[PDB]
Design a protein around this ligand. Structure first.
Ligand code: SF4
Length: 183
């Protein structure tokens, strides 16, 4: 828990290593104090894969869902705690829940209104992507290249370009490669 824990996953240092899909899920969680089912699964299993423990996950999800008075702890415990415990096998299930790779993410139903799961290189408009990439200090030529990959449907190449420009396809590999470059 020394490095990855319920508090450090909200730090700029750790979160600077997240790929765009995880950044988007964390932003939706931060703003709405909730994620719908597919996003809960994508984000909770990514965090499990980076080493967020069972206890630290339950802290993280209970604090994020009850933040700013969004729901009572009693409602969280009645309507969500089981689901997050299940993702960690804490009620005894033996389903093999592994972190989702990019192909798996892309193959989930596309996000609609109110959804934050998916792959932003496919799911965001070019304008929204451009604004986000400018926030990450990319220049116009860089953004044009990333958008070229997006328009060709080469979403994991677009994501690889963003990794290279800001420093098998799998969000957890993006995180691990990025985190290693901080050490
Ligand atoms: S390419 Fe994969 S890691 Fe990158 S944003 Fe899309 S789903 Fe996430």
């Amino acid at each position: 828990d020394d490095e990855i824990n319920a508090q450090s996953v909200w730090s700029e240092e750790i979160s600077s290593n997240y790929p765009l899909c995880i950044k988007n899920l964390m932003e939706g969680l931060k703003k709405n104090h909730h994620l719908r089912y597919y996003g809960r699964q994508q984000l909770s299993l990514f965090l499990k894969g980076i080493g967020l423990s069972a206890d630290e996950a339950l802290k993280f999800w209970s604090e994020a869902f009850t933040r700013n008075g969004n729901m009572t702890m009693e409602k969280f415990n009645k309507e969500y705690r089981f689901s997050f415990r299940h993702n960690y096998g804490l009620e005894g299930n033996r389903i093999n829940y592994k972190p989702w790779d990019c192909h798996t993410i892309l193959s989930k139903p596309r996000p609609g209104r109110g959804d934050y799961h998916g792959c932003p290189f496919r799911d965001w408009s070019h304008e929204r992507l451009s604004a986000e990439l400018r926030s990450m200090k990319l220049t116009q030529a860089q953004i044009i290249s990333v958008l070229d990959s997006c328009q060709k449907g080469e979403y994991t190449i677009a994501c690889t370009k963003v990794f290279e420009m800001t420093h098998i396809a799998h969000p957890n590999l993006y995180f691990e490669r990025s985190r290693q470059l901080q050490k």
